[PDB]
Amino acid sequence: APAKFC
Amino acid sequence: ATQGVFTLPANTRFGVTAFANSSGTQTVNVLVNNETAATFSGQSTNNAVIGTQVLNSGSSGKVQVQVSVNGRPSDLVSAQVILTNELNFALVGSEDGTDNDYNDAVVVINWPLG
Amino acid sequence: ATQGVFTLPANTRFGVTAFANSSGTQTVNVLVNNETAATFSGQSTNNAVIGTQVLNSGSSGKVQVQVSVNGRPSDLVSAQVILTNELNFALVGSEDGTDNDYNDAVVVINWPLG
Ligand SMILES: *C(=O)C[C@@H]1O[C@@H](C)[C@@H](O)[C@@H](O)[C@@H]1O
Ligand SMILES: *C(=O)C[C@@H]1O[C@@H](C)[C@@H](O)[C@@H](O)[C@@H]1O
Ligand SMILES: [Ca+2]
Ligand SMILES: [Ca+2]
Ligand SMILES: [Ca+2]
Ligand SMILES: [Ca+2]
């Protein structure tokens, strides 16, 4: 469950 | 030009509602007099309401809408429209990607209430 | 003039949401090609969402919004506004009484979706 920011 | 920034009449209640149409999780911030007054968050590709609330425009009447996805500001388009000199709509669209449908978070502000 | 009637691009999905700001119970009918396709009901003086749904504009693309309060047709005002030649809003306010704030039921239609 790939989580990302910016 | 600057987009998503609206001058409301002072000390007036307004509704703000945010819709989603993107596989990206939308973060909407509503600022009153430069202070974050409300924050909505959600993901939907079927126009789901990801937040709704009543705010007061305060002494300055300045309301600003900001949209970001995973902490990346979306590009904004906006306008205000007034019907029979009474009913106010402030409208925001945003784009978090490349396809330019500008609906990824749609934000609607309306006043007066009651 | 006629109000609350909108020609959309054919066979297009669109959002429709209704707000309430009256002490009267608001009834909102949305017709697609002159046939009822959605109906919302609710009472609020706090801009509560009384309904939200996605519809298809069908082959004609004709969409009509009606508002009643306890069987009584409300006076409508409407307009459509398009942002960056892509994001569409169809806006309706209505008056059920005498103060003319025209927010008694506020209906917002937006497209494209997705
Ligand atoms: C990917 O996140 C693109 C994002 O979601 C698509 C399904 C579509 O709604 C597009 O407009 C949006 O930018
Ligand atoms: C009733 O007198 C009028 C009805 O309800 C009020 C609370 C207010 O919202 C008014 O605008 C509406 O027409
Ligand atoms: Ca997009
Ligand atoms: Ca989209
Ligand atoms: Ca009224
Ligand atoms: Ca009212």
mmCIF file of C-alpha atoms and ligand atoms in Angstrom:
data_model
loop_
_atom_site.group_PDB
_atom_site.id
_atom_site.type_symbol
_atom_site.label_atom_id
_atom_site.label_comp_id
_atom_site.label_asym_id
_atom_site.label_seq_id
_atom_site.Cartn_x
_atom_site.Cartn_y
_atom_site.Cartn_z
ATOM 1 C CA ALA A 1 0.000 0.000 0.000
ATOM 2 C CA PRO A 2 2.442 2.700 -1.510
ATOM 3 C CA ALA A 3 2.152 5.952 0.620
ATOM 4 C CA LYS A 4 3.824 9.185 -0.714
ATOM 5 C CA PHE A 5 4.394 12.946 -0.081
ATOM 6 C CA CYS A 6 5.286 15.832 -2.597
ATOM 7 C CA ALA B 1 -3.263 35.605 -11.818
ATOM 8 C CA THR B 2 -4.049 34.724 -8.211
ATOM 9 C CA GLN B 3 -6.864 32.152 -7.886
ATOM 10 C CA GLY B 4 -8.944 30.747 -4.997
ATOM 11 C CA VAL B 5 -9.048 34.037 -3.073
ATOM 12 C CA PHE B 6 -12.375 35.678 -2.312
ATOM 13 C CA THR B 7 -13.550 38.804 -0.489
ATOM 14 C CA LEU B 8 -16.810 38.128 1.314
ATOM 15 C CA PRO B 9 -18.785 40.725 3.196
ATOM 16 C CA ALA B 10 -17.474 41.030 6.756
ATOM 17 C CA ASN B 11 -18.755 38.827 9.598
ATOM 18 C CA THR B 12 -20.887 36.704 7.322
ATOM 19 C CA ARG B 13 -21.560 32.960 7.579
ATOM 20 C CA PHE B 14 -20.800 30.963 4.437
ATOM 21 C CA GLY B 15 -20.984 27.285 3.438
ATOM 22 C CA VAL B 16 -17.952 25.524 2.031
ATOM 23 C CA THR B 17 -18.120 22.075 0.413
ATOM 24 C CA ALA B 18 -15.444 20.070 -1.382
ATOM 25 C CA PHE B 19 -15.884 17.285 -3.995
ATOM 26 C CA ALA B 20 -13.346 14.769 -5.288
ATOM 27 C CA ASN B 21 -12.694 13.411 -8.817
ATOM 28 C CA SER B 22 -9.196 11.906 -8.867
ATOM 29 C CA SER B 23 -7.379 8.732 -7.839
ATOM 30 C CA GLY B 24 -5.236 11.116 -5.749
ATOM 31 C CA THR B 25 -6.230 11.913 -2.161
ATOM 32 C CA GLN B 26 -7.298 15.543 -2.068
ATOM 33 C CA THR B 27 -6.386 17.919 0.792
ATOM 34 C CA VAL B 28 -8.417 21.124 0.832
ATOM 35 C CA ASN B 29 -7.603 23.992 3.221
ATOM 36 C CA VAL B 30 -9.925 26.928 3.795
ATOM 37 C CA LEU B 31 -8.298 30.037 5.242
ATOM 38 C CA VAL B 32 -10.059 32.957 6.878
ATOM 39 C CA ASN B 33 -7.978 36.158 7.296
ATOM 40 C CA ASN B 34 -4.858 34.104 6.453
ATOM 41 C CA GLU B 35 -5.550 31.491 9.190
ATOM 42 C CA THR B 36 -6.407 27.876 8.367
ATOM 43 C CA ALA B 37 -10.053 27.598 9.406
ATOM 44 C CA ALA B 38 -10.994 24.244 7.860
ATOM 45 C CA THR B 39 -9.341 21.203 6.273
ATOM 46 C CA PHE B 40 -10.995 18.507 4.184
ATOM 47 C CA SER B 41 -9.435 15.262 3.065
ATOM 48 C CA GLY B 42 -10.624 12.416 0.865
ATOM 49 C CA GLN B 43 -10.302 10.359 -2.286
ATOM 50 C CA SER B 44 -12.971 9.668 -4.851
ATOM 51 C CA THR B 45 -13.455 9.504 -8.621
ATOM 52 C CA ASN B 46 -17.246 9.791 -8.324
ATOM 53 C CA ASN B 47 -17.691 13.365 -7.028
ATOM 54 C CA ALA B 48 -17.960 12.313 -3.379
ATOM 55 C CA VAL B 49 -18.342 15.129 -0.866
ATOM 56 C CA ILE B 50 -15.053 14.985 1.041
ATOM 57 C CA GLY B 51 -16.002 17.806 3.422
ATOM 58 C CA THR B 52 -18.610 20.423 4.254
ATOM 59 C CA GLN B 53 -18.785 23.143 6.866
ATOM 60 C CA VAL B 54 -20.040 26.546 7.876
ATOM 61 C CA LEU B 55 -17.478 29.274 8.564
ATOM 62 C CA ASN B 56 -17.568 32.980 9.414
ATOM 63 C CA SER B 57 -15.709 35.381 7.164
ATOM 64 C CA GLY B 58 -14.600 37.471 10.138
ATOM 65 C CA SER B 59 -13.591 41.130 10.143
ATOM 66 C CA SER B 60 -11.463 41.078 6.924
ATOM 67 C CA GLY B 61 -13.910 39.023 4.880
ATOM 68 C CA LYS B 62 -10.908 37.375 3.210
ATOM 69 C CA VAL B 63 -11.352 33.682 2.367
ATOM 70 C CA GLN B 64 -8.720 31.596 0.621
ATOM 71 C CA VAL B 65 -9.031 28.057 -0.783
ATOM 72 C CA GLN B 66 -5.940 25.872 -1.248
ATOM 73 C CA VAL B 67 -5.693 22.384 -2.696
ATOM 74 C CA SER B 68 -2.880 19.878 -2.461
ATOM 75 C CA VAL B 69 -2.298 16.211 -3.204
ATOM 76 C CA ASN B 70 0.159 14.374 -1.009
ATOM 77 C CA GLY B 71 1.483 17.790 -0.230
ATOM 78 C CA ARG B 72 1.640 19.212 -3.738
ATOM 79 C CA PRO B 73 -0.422 22.287 -4.513
ATOM 80 C CA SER B 74 -2.843 21.726 -7.379
ATOM 81 C CA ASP B 75 -3.182 24.413 -10.038
ATOM 82 C CA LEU B 76 -6.293 26.443 -9.328
ATOM 83 C CA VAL B 77 -9.010 28.118 -11.355
ATOM 84 C CA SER B 78 -11.725 30.185 -9.775
ATOM 85 C CA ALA B 79 -14.517 32.645 -10.148
ATOM 86 C CA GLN B 80 -17.330 34.255 -8.190
ATOM 87 C CA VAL B 81 -20.872 34.563 -9.554
ATOM 88 C CA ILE B 82 -23.865 36.383 -8.058
ATOM 89 C CA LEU B 83 -27.526 35.655 -8.852
ATOM 90 C CA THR B 84 -30.361 38.197 -8.551
ATOM 91 C CA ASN B 85 -27.947 40.520 -6.681
ATOM 92 C CA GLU B 86 -28.241 38.309 -3.592
ATOM 93 C CA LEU B 87 -27.125 34.676 -3.899
ATOM 94 C CA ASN B 88 -23.353 34.287 -3.952
ATOM 95 C CA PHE B 89 -21.211 31.406 -5.284
ATOM 96 C CA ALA B 90 -17.446 31.242 -5.081
ATOM 97 C CA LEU B 91 -16.198 28.430 -7.290
ATOM 98 C CA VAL B 92 -12.861 26.645 -7.330
ATOM 99 C CA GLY B 93 -11.490 23.900 -9.541
ATOM 100 C CA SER B 94 -8.057 22.286 -9.340
ATOM 101 C CA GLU B 95 -5.667 20.080 -11.308
ATOM 102 C CA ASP B 96 -3.259 17.644 -9.670
ATOM 103 C CA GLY B 97 -2.067 15.965 -12.853
ATOM 104 C CA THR B 98 -1.571 16.271 -16.593
ATOM 105 C CA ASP B 99 -4.990 15.689 -18.172
ATOM 106 C CA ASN B 100 -6.347 19.135 -17.273
ATOM 107 C CA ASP B 101 -9.890 18.212 -16.429
ATOM 108 C CA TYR B 102 -9.566 20.625 -13.413
ATOM 109 C CA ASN B 103 -12.155 18.741 -11.339
ATOM 110 C CA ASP B 104 -9.793 16.793 -9.151
ATOM 111 C CA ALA B 105 -11.005 18.735 -6.149
ATOM 112 C CA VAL B 106 -13.978 21.005 -6.785
ATOM 113 C CA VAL B 107 -14.718 23.545 -4.050
ATOM 114 C CA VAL B 108 -17.951 25.431 -3.687
ATOM 115 C CA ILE B 109 -18.501 28.330 -1.320
ATOM 116 C CA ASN B 110 -22.002 29.788 -0.956
ATOM 117 C CA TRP B 111 -23.648 32.675 0.966
ATOM 118 C CA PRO B 112 -25.790 33.980 2.594
ATOM 119 C CA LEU B 113 -26.981 31.122 4.818
ATOM 120 C CA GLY B 114 -30.075 30.653 6.977
ATOM 121 C CA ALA C 1 -37.156 33.842 -18.399
ATOM 122 C CA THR C 2 -36.928 30.120 -17.867
ATOM 123 C CA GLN C 3 -34.565 29.153 -15.058
ATOM 124 C CA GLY C 4 -33.129 25.851 -13.819
ATOM 125 C CA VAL C 5 -32.837 24.357 -17.329
ATOM 126 C CA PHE C 6 -29.424 23.352 -18.694
ATOM 127 C CA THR C 7 -28.088 21.763 -21.867
ATOM 128 C CA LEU C 8 -25.187 19.446 -21.108
ATOM 129 C CA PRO C 9 -23.021 17.510 -23.523
ATOM 130 C CA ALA C 10 -24.881 14.304 -24.374
ATOM 131 C CA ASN C 11 -24.223 11.062 -22.473
ATOM 132 C CA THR C 12 -22.097 12.733 -19.859
ATOM 133 C CA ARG C 13 -22.036 11.919 -16.145
ATOM 134 C CA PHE C 14 -22.572 14.934 -13.880
ATOM 135 C CA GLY C 15 -22.715 15.619 -10.148
ATOM 136 C CA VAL C 16 -25.771 17.132 -8.513
ATOM 137 C CA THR C 17 -25.897 18.357 -4.940
ATOM 138 C CA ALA C 18 -28.509 20.271 -2.975
ATOM 139 C CA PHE C 19 -28.218 22.526 0.054
ATOM 140 C CA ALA C 20 -30.955 23.706 2.379
ATOM 141 C CA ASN C 21 -31.307 27.087 4.152
ATOM 142 C CA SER C 22 -34.957 27.410 5.110
ATOM 143 C CA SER C 23 -37.291 26.439 7.934
ATOM 144 C CA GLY C 24 -39.356 24.734 5.230
ATOM 145 C CA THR C 25 -38.710 21.224 3.964
ATOM 146 C CA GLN C 26 -37.039 21.496 0.546
ATOM 147 C CA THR C 27 -37.957 19.149 -2.301
ATOM 148 C CA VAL C 28 -35.549 19.033 -5.258
ATOM 149 C CA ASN C 29 -36.407 17.233 -8.519
ATOM 150 C CA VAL C 30 -33.840 16.722 -11.237
ATOM 151 C CA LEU C 31 -35.267 15.752 -14.630
ATOM 152 C CA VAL C 32 -33.219 14.276 -17.444
ATOM 153 C CA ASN C 33 -34.929 14.384 -20.844
ATOM 154 C CA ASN C 34 -38.171 15.510 -19.148
ATOM 155 C CA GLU C 35 -38.229 12.494 -16.845
ATOM 156 C CA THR C 36 -37.484 12.495 -13.112
ATOM 157 C CA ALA C 37 -34.075 10.968 -12.391
ATOM 158 C CA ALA C 38 -33.396 12.194 -8.868
ATOM 159 C CA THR C 39 -35.292 13.579 -5.920
ATOM 160 C CA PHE C 40 -33.885 15.050 -2.709
ATOM 161 C CA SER C 41 -35.719 16.118 0.448
ATOM 162 C CA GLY C 42 -34.663 17.784 3.669
ATOM 163 C CA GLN C 43 -34.920 20.678 6.051
ATOM 164 C CA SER C 44 -32.088 22.825 7.378
ATOM 165 C CA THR C 45 -31.185 26.427 8.103
ATOM 166 C CA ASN C 46 -27.528 25.504 8.297
ATOM 167 C CA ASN C 47 -26.700 24.747 4.641
ATOM 168 C CA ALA C 48 -26.882 21.019 5.213
ATOM 169 C CA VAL C 49 -26.534 18.820 2.161
ATOM 170 C CA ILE C 50 -29.926 17.205 1.617
ATOM 171 C CA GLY C 51 -28.826 15.117 -1.335
ATOM 172 C CA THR C 52 -25.961 14.370 -3.659
ATOM 173 C CA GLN C 53 -25.893 12.012 -6.593
ATOM 174 C CA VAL C 54 -24.345 11.362 -10.006
ATOM 175 C CA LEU C 55 -26.538 11.259 -13.126
ATOM 176 C CA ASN C 56 -26.214 10.775 -16.881
ATOM 177 C CA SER C 57 -27.348 13.519 -19.293
ATOM 178 C CA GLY C 58 -28.601 10.916 -21.759
ATOM 179 C CA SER C 59 -28.902 11.466 -25.510
ATOM 180 C CA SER C 60 -30.609 14.916 -25.302
ATOM 181 C CA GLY C 61 -28.384 16.390 -22.604
ATOM 182 C CA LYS C 62 -31.370 18.323 -21.251
ATOM 183 C CA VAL C 63 -31.337 18.692 -17.449
ATOM 184 C CA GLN C 64 -34.022 20.494 -15.459
ATOM 185 C CA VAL C 65 -34.004 21.357 -11.772
ATOM 186 C CA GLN C 66 -37.232 21.974 -9.900
ATOM 187 C CA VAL C 67 -37.741 22.993 -6.280
ATOM 188 C CA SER C 68 -40.941 22.668 -4.248
ATOM 189 C CA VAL C 69 -41.769 23.325 -0.647
ATOM 190 C CA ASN C 70 -44.678 21.179 0.506
ATOM 191 C CA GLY C 71 -45.957 20.980 -3.078
ATOM 192 C CA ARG C 72 -45.388 24.718 -3.730
ATOM 193 C CA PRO C 73 -43.022 25.601 -6.651
ATOM 194 C CA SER C 74 -40.189 27.891 -5.540
ATOM 195 C CA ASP C 75 -39.039 30.835 -7.687
ATOM 196 C CA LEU C 76 -35.758 29.900 -9.324
ATOM 197 C CA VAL C 77 -32.656 31.800 -10.420
ATOM 198 C CA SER C 78 -29.925 30.114 -12.417
ATOM 199 C CA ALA C 79 -26.780 30.432 -14.409
ATOM 200 C CA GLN C 80 -24.031 28.291 -15.907
ATOM 201 C CA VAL C 81 -20.361 29.147 -15.639
ATOM 202 C CA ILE C 82 -17.405 27.509 -17.331
ATOM 203 C CA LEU C 83 -13.846 27.728 -16.029
ATOM 204 C CA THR C 84 -10.714 27.367 -18.195
ATOM 205 C CA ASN C 85 -13.028 26.138 -20.986
ATOM 206 C CA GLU C 86 -13.324 22.791 -19.219
ATOM 207 C CA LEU C 87 -14.827 22.807 -15.708
ATOM 208 C CA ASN C 88 -18.586 23.341 -15.774
ATOM 209 C CA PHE C 89 -20.995 24.616 -13.097
ATOM 210 C CA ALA C 90 -24.752 24.805 -13.354
ATOM 211 C CA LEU C 91 -26.090 26.818 -10.432
ATOM 212 C CA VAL C 92 -29.606 27.201 -9.006
ATOM 213 C CA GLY C 93 -31.001 29.183 -6.104
ATOM 214 C CA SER C 94 -34.657 29.249 -5.096
ATOM 215 C CA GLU C 95 -37.081 31.274 -2.978
ATOM 216 C CA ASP C 96 -39.950 29.713 -1.024
ATOM 217 C CA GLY C 97 -40.976 32.822 0.852
ATOM 218 C CA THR C 98 -40.721 36.575 1.037
ATOM 219 C CA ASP C 99 -37.277 37.551 2.280
ATOM 220 C CA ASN C 100 -35.768 36.893 -1.171
ATOM 221 C CA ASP C 101 -32.455 35.474 0.045
ATOM 222 C CA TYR C 102 -32.894 32.879 -2.714
ATOM 223 C CA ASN C 103 -30.893 30.259 -0.789
ATOM 224 C CA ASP C 104 -33.799 28.192 0.462
ATOM 225 C CA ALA C 105 -32.638 25.345 -1.691
ATOM 226 C CA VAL C 106 -29.277 25.782 -3.415
ATOM 227 C CA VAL C 107 -28.512 23.249 -6.156
ATOM 228 C CA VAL C 108 -25.120 22.787 -7.772
ATOM 229 C CA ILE C 109 -24.450 20.693 -10.846
ATOM 230 C CA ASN C 110 -20.874 20.020 -11.927
ATOM 231 C CA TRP C 111 -19.160 18.227 -14.797
ATOM 232 C CA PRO C 112 -17.089 16.557 -16.113
ATOM 233 C CA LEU C 113 -16.612 13.943 -13.374
ATOM 234 C CA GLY C 114 -13.922 11.308 -12.854
HETATM 235 C C1 LIG D 1 -4.235 10.424 -11.381
HETATM 236 O O1 LIG D 1 -4.245 10.644 -10.174
HETATM 237 C C2 LIG D 1 -4.960 11.438 -12.277
HETATM 238 C C3 LIG D 1 -6.153 11.905 -11.441
HETATM 239 O O2 LIG D 1 -7.074 10.857 -11.389
HETATM 240 C C4 LIG D 1 -7.608 10.436 -12.625
HETATM 241 C C5 LIG D 1 -8.479 9.213 -12.413
HETATM 242 C C6 LIG D 1 -8.414 11.576 -13.206
HETATM 243 O O3 LIG D 1 -9.522 11.839 -12.363
HETATM 244 C C7 LIG D 1 -7.539 12.826 -13.342
HETATM 245 O O4 LIG D 1 -8.289 13.974 -13.665
HETATM 246 C C8 LIG D 1 -6.783 13.158 -12.061
HETATM 247 O O5 LIG D 1 -5.800 14.083 -12.388
HETATM 248 C C1 LIG D 2 -40.087 31.602 6.758
HETATM 249 O O1 LIG D 2 -40.590 32.599 7.263
HETATM 250 C C2 LIG D 2 -39.087 31.797 5.581
HETATM 251 C C3 LIG D 2 -38.222 30.592 5.176
HETATM 252 O O2 LIG D 2 -37.537 30.098 6.288
HETATM 253 C C4 LIG D 2 -36.657 31.010 6.957
HETATM 254 C C5 LIG D 2 -35.916 30.381 8.126
HETATM 255 C C6 LIG D 2 -35.642 31.620 6.002
HETATM 256 O O3 LIG D 2 -34.702 30.659 5.583
HETATM 257 C C7 LIG D 2 -36.355 32.200 4.794
HETATM 258 O O4 LIG D 2 -35.403 32.689 3.901
HETATM 259 C C8 LIG D 2 -37.197 31.111 4.142
HETATM 260 O O5 LIG D 2 -37.790 31.681 3.009
HETATM 261 CA CA CA D 3 -6.896 16.079 -13.435
HETATM 262 CA CA CA D 4 -10.215 14.342 -12.455
HETATM 263 CA CA CA D 5 -36.040 32.723 1.487
HETATM 264 CA CA CA D 6 -33.462 31.135 3.530
#
